[PDB]
Protein backbone atom coordinates (compact mmCIF):
# COMPACT_ATOMS: atom_id res chain seq x y z
CA UNK A 1 0.00 0.00 0.00
CA UNK A 2 2.38 2.64 1.31
CA UNK A 3 4.92 2.31 -1.48
CA UNK A 4 2.20 1.75 -4.10
CA UNK A 5 0.73 5.23 -3.62
CA UNK A 6 4.16 6.74 -4.15
CA UNK A 7 4.24 4.50 -7.21
CA UNK A 8 1.20 6.32 -8.56
CA UNK A 9 3.16 9.50 -7.88
CA UNK A 10 6.38 8.28 -9.46
CA UNK A 11 4.26 7.54 -12.51
CA UNK A 12 2.95 11.11 -12.34
CA UNK A 13 6.53 12.35 -12.38
CA UNK A 14 6.71 9.79 -15.16
CA UNK A 15 4.70 12.16 -17.35
CA UNK A 16 5.69 15.35 -15.53
CA UNK A 17 8.79 15.68 -17.68
CA UNK A 18 6.14 17.46 -19.73
CA UNK A 19 5.96 21.01 -18.41
CA UNK A 20 2.49 20.87 -19.90
CA UNK A 21 1.19 21.87 -17.58
CA UNK A 22 2.66 22.01 -15.14
CA UNK A 23 1.66 19.34 -15.05
CA UNK A 24 1.09 18.16 -12.53
CA UNK A 25 0.00 15.17 -14.53
CA UNK A 26 -3.76 15.22 -15.21
CA UNK A 27 -5.72 15.55 -13.16
CA UNK A 28 -3.80 17.05 -10.28
CA UNK A 29 -2.86 13.38 -9.82
CA UNK A 30 0.18 14.92 -8.17
CA UNK A 31 -1.22 13.41 -5.02
CA UNK A 32 -2.57 9.97 -5.76
CA UNK A 33 -0.25 9.24 -2.84
CA UNK A 34 -3.21 10.05 -0.58
CA UNK A 35 -3.07 11.52 2.92
CA UNK A 36 -0.67 9.21 4.85
CA UNK A 37 -2.80 7.68 3.71
CA UNK A 38 -5.95 5.62 3.26
CA UNK A 39 -4.43 4.38 6.50
CA UNK A 40 -5.37 4.39 9.13
CA UNK A 41 -6.12 6.84 10.63
CA UNK A 42 -8.28 7.90 13.58
CA UNK A 43 -11.89 6.62 13.48
CA UNK A 44 -11.78 2.85 13.96
CA UNK A 45 -8.11 3.33 14.88
CA UNK A 46 -9.18 1.14 17.78
CA UNK A 47 -8.09 0.13 20.08
CA UNK A 48 -8.32 3.52 18.40
CA UNK A 49 -7.97 4.87 21.89
CA UNK A 50 -9.59 3.22 24.89
CA UNK A 51 -9.82 5.89 27.58
CA UNK A 52 -9.86 5.06 31.28
CA UNK A 53 -10.90 8.23 33.10
CA UNK A 54 -10.77 8.49 36.88
CA UNK A 55 -12.47 10.48 39.64
CA UNK A 56 -12.38 10.27 43.41
CA UNK A 57 -13.28 6.70 44.39
CA UNK A 58 -14.81 6.00 40.98
CA UNK A 59 -13.11 4.86 37.79
CA UNK A 60 -14.85 4.97 34.42
CA UNK A 61 -13.45 2.54 31.86
CA UNK A 62 -14.95 3.30 28.46
CA UNK A 63 -14.10 1.48 25.27
CA UNK A 64 -15.13 3.75 22.35
CA UNK A 65 -14.30 7.42 22.81
CA UNK A 66 -15.08 10.27 20.46
CA UNK A 67 -13.44 13.59 21.35
CA UNK A 68 -12.97 16.14 24.14
CA UNK A 69 -15.13 18.80 22.41
CA UNK A 70 -14.49 21.97 24.41
CA UNK A 71 -16.17 25.29 23.57
CA UNK A 72 -14.00 28.36 22.94
CA UNK A 73 -10.71 28.98 24.81
CA UNK A 74 -12.22 28.05 28.14
CA UNK A 75 -9.52 29.15 30.65
CA UNK A 76 -11.85 28.43 33.53
CA UNK A 77 -11.34 29.34 37.17
CA UNK A 78 -11.17 29.91 40.37
CA UNK A 79 -12.69 33.25 41.28
CA UNK A 80 -12.89 35.86 39.91
CA UNK A 81 -13.15 37.75 41.99
CA UNK A 82 -14.62 40.16 41.73
CA UNK A 83 -15.22 39.88 44.54
CA UNK A 84 -18.02 37.36 45.05
CA UNK A 85 -18.66 37.71 48.77
CA UNK A 86 -15.09 37.80 50.09
CA UNK A 87 -15.71 34.71 52.20
CA UNK A 88 -13.21 32.07 51.10
CA UNK A 89 -13.56 29.22 50.79
CA UNK A 90 -14.37 27.16 52.98
CA UNK A 91 -13.67 23.78 54.71
CA UNK A 92 -14.68 21.12 54.38
CA UNK A 93 -11.66 22.14 54.13
CA UNK A 94 -13.25 24.31 56.24
CA UNK A 95 -16.91 24.76 57.20
CA UNK A 96 -17.22 21.36 58.95
CA UNK A 97 -14.97 22.45 61.81
CA UNK A 98 -15.80 25.42 64.03
CA UNK A 99 -17.05 26.25 67.49
CA UNK A 100 -20.48 25.37 67.82
CA UNK A 101 -22.88 25.44 70.79
CA UNK A 102 -23.52 22.22 72.70
CA UNK A 103 -25.04 23.08 76.09
CA UNK A 104 -27.86 24.16 78.38
CA UNK A 105 -29.06 25.54 81.70
CA UNK A 106 -29.42 24.15 85.19
CA UNK A 107 -28.10 24.84 88.68
CA UNK A 108 -28.87 26.03 92.23
CA UNK A 109 -28.34 24.29 95.52
CA UNK A 110 -30.04 20.93 95.03
CA UNK A 111 -26.63 19.55 94.02
CA UNK A 112 -24.14 18.22 96.52
CA UNK A 113 -20.52 18.54 95.45
CA UNK A 114 -20.17 15.03 94.07
CA UNK A 115 -23.50 15.26 92.23
CA UNK A 116 -23.06 15.12 88.46
CA UNK A 117 -23.90 18.14 86.29
CA UNK A 118 -23.92 18.22 82.48
CA UNK A 119 -22.42 15.40 80.40
CA UNK A 120 -21.63 16.31 76.78
CA UNK A 121 -21.81 13.50 74.29
CA UNK A 122 -19.18 11.53 72.35
CA UNK A 123 -18.20 12.33 68.70
CA UNK A 124 -21.75 11.42 67.76
CA UNK A 125 -22.71 14.84 69.11
CA UNK A 126 -21.51 16.70 66.05
CA UNK A 127 -23.25 14.19 63.78
CA UNK A 128 -26.67 14.39 65.42
CA UNK A 129 -26.20 18.12 65.74
CA UNK A 130 -28.44 19.55 63.04
CA UNK A 131 -25.98 22.14 61.74
CA UNK A 132 -22.36 21.85 60.65
CA UNK A 133 -20.55 18.89 59.08
CA UNK A 134 -21.41 16.45 61.93
CA UNK A 135 -24.46 16.19 59.71
CA UNK A 136 -23.79 16.61 56.05
CA UNK A 137 -20.51 14.98 55.28
CA UNK A 138 -20.45 12.61 58.20
CA UNK A 139 -23.92 11.60 57.26
CA UNK A 140 -22.17 10.30 54.17
CA UNK A 141 -18.92 8.71 55.33
CA UNK A 142 -18.64 6.28 58.23
CA UNK A 143 -15.13 6.90 59.58
CA UNK A 144 -13.87 9.85 61.62
CA UNK A 145 -10.46 10.72 63.04
CA UNK A 146 -10.03 14.20 64.48
CA UNK A 147 -8.60 16.22 67.34
CA UNK A 148 -10.71 18.34 69.64
CA UNK A 149 -10.60 21.90 70.93
CA UNK A 150 -12.93 23.23 73.62
CA UNK A 151 -13.89 26.54 75.16
CA UNK A 152 -16.22 26.21 78.13
CA UNK A 153 -18.08 29.31 79.28
CA UNK A 154 -19.64 29.84 82.69
CA UNK A 155 -20.36 33.43 83.71
CA UNK A 156 -21.75 34.23 87.14
CA UNK A 157 -22.83 37.51 88.64
CA UNK A 158 -20.09 39.05 90.76
Amino acid sequence: LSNVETEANNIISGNEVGGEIITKVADDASNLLGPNSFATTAQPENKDVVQATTTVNTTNLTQHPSAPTIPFTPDFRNVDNFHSMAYDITTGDKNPSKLIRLDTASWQTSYSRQYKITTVELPKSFWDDTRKPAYGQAKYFAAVRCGFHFQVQVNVNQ
Binding site: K24, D27, D28, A29, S30, N31, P35, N36, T41, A42, Q43, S66, A67, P68, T69, I70, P71, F72, F82
Partner: protein, 198 residues
Protein backbone atom coordinates in the same frame (compact mmCIF):
# COMPACT_ATOMS: atom_id res chain seq x y z
CA UNK B 1 -7.18 13.75 6.37
CA UNK B 2 -10.86 14.08 5.49
CA UNK B 3 -12.07 14.88 9.01
CA UNK B 4 -14.47 12.88 11.18
CA UNK B 5 -17.35 14.41 13.14
CA UNK B 6 -17.56 13.46 16.82
CA UNK B 7 -13.79 13.09 16.62
CA UNK B 8 -10.85 15.30 17.57
CA UNK B 9 -10.12 17.91 18.67
CA UNK B 10 -12.05 21.09 19.39
CA UNK B 11 -13.96 23.99 17.90
CA UNK B 12 -11.17 25.40 15.73
CA UNK B 13 -11.40 24.22 12.14
CA UNK B 14 -8.35 24.07 9.94
CA UNK B 15 -6.59 25.00 6.72
CA UNK B 16 -9.09 22.61 5.07
CA UNK B 17 -6.18 21.10 3.20
CA UNK B 18 -4.29 22.42 0.20
CA UNK B 19 -5.94 20.22 -2.42
CA UNK B 20 -6.60 19.60 -5.40
CA UNK B 21 -3.77 19.60 -6.74
CA UNK B 22 -4.09 23.05 -8.27
CA UNK B 23 -6.01 22.86 -10.69
CA UNK B 24 -5.72 25.87 -11.79
CA UNK B 25 -8.65 27.31 -9.76
CA UNK B 26 -9.75 24.47 -8.63
CA UNK B 27 -9.49 23.54 -5.03
CA UNK B 28 -7.01 26.06 -3.64
CA UNK B 29 -4.21 28.59 -3.94
CA UNK B 30 -6.81 31.08 -2.65
CA UNK B 31 -4.51 33.79 -1.38
CA UNK B 32 -6.29 36.74 0.23
CA UNK B 33 -5.94 40.01 -1.63
CA UNK B 34 -7.27 42.98 0.29
CA UNK B 35 -9.26 45.11 -2.10
CA UNK B 36 -10.19 48.03 0.15
CA UNK B 37 -7.87 50.73 1.45
CA UNK B 38 -7.58 48.70 3.68
CA UNK B 39 -9.76 49.38 6.65
CA UNK B 40 -10.57 45.65 6.42
CA UNK B 41 -12.64 45.97 9.59
CA UNK B 42 -15.74 45.56 7.43
CA UNK B 43 -15.25 41.92 8.32
CA UNK B 44 -13.87 42.87 11.76
CA UNK B 45 -15.77 43.89 14.88
CA UNK B 46 -15.66 47.30 16.50
CA UNK B 47 -16.08 49.33 13.34
CA UNK B 48 -19.47 47.87 12.46
CA UNK B 49 -20.99 48.54 15.85
CA UNK B 50 -19.13 51.81 15.52
CA UNK B 51 -21.66 52.80 12.90
CA UNK B 52 -25.12 53.81 14.03
CA UNK B 53 -28.75 54.15 13.01
CA UNK B 54 -31.12 51.92 14.92
CA UNK B 55 -34.44 52.76 16.49
CA UNK B 56 -36.33 55.65 14.96
CA UNK B 57 -38.96 56.09 17.62
CA UNK B 58 -40.28 57.90 20.66
CA UNK B 59 -42.87 60.30 19.36
CA UNK B 60 -44.11 62.80 21.88
CA UNK B 61 -47.51 63.97 23.04
CA UNK B 62 -47.13 67.42 24.53
CA UNK B 63 -49.13 67.01 27.71
CA UNK B 64 -47.53 67.29 29.96
CA UNK B 65 -43.95 66.55 30.93
CA UNK B 66 -42.14 64.33 33.40
CA UNK B 67 -40.97 61.39 31.34
CA UNK B 68 -42.18 58.59 30.79
CA UNK B 69 -38.83 56.94 31.28
CA UNK B 70 -38.39 54.78 28.22
CA UNK B 71 -36.71 51.37 28.17
CA UNK B 72 -33.98 51.31 25.56
CA UNK B 73 -33.95 47.66 24.48
CA UNK B 74 -30.60 48.14 22.72
CA UNK B 75 -32.30 45.79 20.33
CA UNK B 76 -34.47 46.16 18.49
CA UNK B 77 -32.28 47.21 17.14
CA UNK B 78 -34.04 46.77 14.56
CA UNK B 79 -32.35 47.64 11.27
CA UNK B 80 -28.71 46.48 11.43
CA UNK B 81 -29.85 44.03 14.16
CA UNK B 82 -29.03 40.96 12.07
CA UNK B 83 -25.79 40.93 14.09
CA UNK B 84 -25.44 39.25 17.57
CA UNK B 85 -25.66 36.68 20.36
CA UNK B 86 -23.57 38.05 23.23
CA UNK B 87 -23.67 40.52 26.19
CA UNK B 88 -22.17 43.96 27.03
CA UNK B 89 -20.69 47.31 25.91
CA UNK B 90 -20.38 50.97 26.88
CA UNK B 91 -22.74 53.01 24.70
CA UNK B 92 -22.75 56.21 22.66
CA UNK B 93 -26.12 57.96 22.44
CA UNK B 94 -27.41 60.30 19.76
CA UNK B 95 -30.35 62.57 20.58
CA UNK B 96 -32.38 64.77 18.24
CA UNK B 97 -35.23 67.21 18.86
CA UNK B 98 -37.75 68.56 16.34
CA UNK B 99 -39.87 71.24 17.97
CA UNK B 100 -40.98 74.86 18.20
CA UNK B 101 -38.96 77.22 16.04
CA UNK B 102 -36.04 77.63 18.41
CA UNK B 103 -38.47 78.15 21.27
CA UNK B 104 -37.74 75.48 23.81
CA UNK B 105 -35.16 73.24 25.52
CA UNK B 106 -34.87 69.53 26.28
CA UNK B 107 -33.17 68.03 29.32
CA UNK B 108 -32.02 64.42 29.23
CA UNK B 109 -29.96 61.73 31.08
CA UNK B 110 -29.72 58.05 32.26
CA UNK B 111 -29.55 55.37 34.07
CA UNK B 112 -29.82 52.85 36.05
CA UNK B 113 -32.07 51.72 37.98
CA UNK B 114 -35.65 51.31 39.17
CA UNK B 115 -37.39 54.49 40.32
CA UNK B 116 -37.00 57.79 42.16
CA UNK B 117 -39.18 60.80 43.02
CA UNK B 118 -37.41 63.22 41.99
CA UNK B 119 -35.03 65.94 40.88
CA UNK B 120 -33.50 64.28 37.86
CA UNK B 121 -30.72 66.81 37.37
CA UNK B 122 -28.78 65.06 40.12
CA UNK B 123 -27.91 61.92 38.17
CA UNK B 124 -27.03 64.20 35.28
CA UNK B 125 -28.20 66.73 32.73
CA UNK B 126 -27.62 67.67 29.06
CA UNK B 127 -29.58 70.74 28.03
CA UNK B 128 -30.09 70.35 24.30
CA UNK B 129 -31.58 73.40 22.57
CA UNK B 130 -34.31 73.34 19.98
CA UNK B 131 -33.33 71.92 16.60
CA UNK B 132 -29.83 70.75 17.48
CA UNK B 133 -27.65 67.67 17.10
CA UNK B 134 -27.72 64.31 18.73
CA UNK B 135 -24.70 64.02 20.96
CA UNK B 136 -23.67 62.03 24.06
CA UNK B 137 -21.42 59.23 25.22
CA UNK B 138 -21.94 57.36 28.48
CA UNK B 139 -19.25 55.27 30.13
CA UNK B 140 -20.68 52.55 32.36
CA UNK B 141 -20.51 51.60 36.05
CA UNK B 142 -23.14 50.30 38.48
CA UNK B 143 -24.35 49.44 35.96
CA UNK B 144 -23.73 46.53 38.30
CA UNK B 145 -20.63 45.20 36.48
CA UNK B 146 -21.25 41.51 35.71
CA UNK B 147 -21.89 42.59 32.09
CA UNK B 148 -25.57 42.65 31.10
CA UNK B 149 -28.16 39.86 30.71
CA UNK B 150 -27.95 40.11 26.93
CA UNK B 151 -31.68 39.80 26.24
CA UNK B 152 -33.38 41.61 29.13
CA UNK B 153 -33.85 43.78 27.45
CA UNK B 154 -31.77 45.72 27.36
CA UNK B 155 -31.24 46.60 30.99
CA UNK B 156 -31.76 50.32 31.43
CA UNK B 157 -33.83 53.43 30.90
CA UNK B 158 -33.58 56.87 29.31
CA UNK B 159 -35.03 59.91 31.05
CA UNK B 160 -36.34 62.79 28.91
CA UNK B 161 -37.92 65.99 30.27
CA UNK B 162 -39.07 68.69 27.81
CA UNK B 163 -38.93 71.55 30.34
CA UNK B 164 -41.25 74.41 29.45
CA UNK B 165 -43.92 74.29 26.75
CA UNK B 166 -44.64 76.23 23.57
CA UNK B 167 -48.30 75.21 23.02
CA UNK B 168 -47.55 73.32 19.79
CA UNK B 169 -46.52 69.71 19.25
CA UNK B 170 -43.09 68.29 19.96
CA UNK B 171 -41.04 65.40 18.67
CA UNK B 172 -37.76 63.63 19.40
CA UNK B 173 -35.41 61.02 17.95
CA UNK B 174 -32.99 58.57 19.52
CA UNK B 175 -30.17 56.84 17.70
CA UNK B 176 -27.59 54.56 19.31
CA UNK B 177 -24.08 53.44 18.59
CA UNK B 178 -21.85 51.56 21.02
CA UNK B 179 -18.13 52.10 20.54
CA UNK B 180 -14.96 50.14 21.44
CA UNK B 181 -17.13 47.22 22.48
CA UNK B 182 -15.24 45.15 25.01
CA UNK B 183 -17.79 42.43 24.20
CA UNK B 184 -15.00 40.04 23.22
CA UNK B 185 -17.53 38.97 22.45
CA UNK B 186 -18.27 36.52 25.26
CA UNK B 187 -19.57 32.95 24.83
CA UNK B 188 -19.80 33.32 21.07
CA UNK B 189 -21.90 32.86 19.24
CA UNK B 190 -24.47 30.86 21.19
CA UNK B 191 -27.83 32.63 21.02
CA UNK B 192 -27.88 31.40 17.42
CA UNK B 193 -30.95 33.68 16.92
CA UNK B 194 -31.85 31.84 13.75
CA UNK B 195 -35.33 32.86 14.33
CA UNK B 196 -35.73 33.95 10.76
CA UNK B 197 -38.93 32.70 12.24
CA UNK B 198 -39.88 36.30 11.39
Amino acid sequence: QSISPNELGLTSAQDDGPLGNEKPNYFLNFRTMNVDIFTVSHTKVDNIFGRAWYVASHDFNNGDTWRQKLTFPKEGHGMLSQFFAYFTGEINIHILYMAEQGFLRVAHTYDTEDNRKTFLSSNGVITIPAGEQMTLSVPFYSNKPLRTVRHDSALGFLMCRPMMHGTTRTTAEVYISLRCPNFFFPVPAPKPTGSRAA
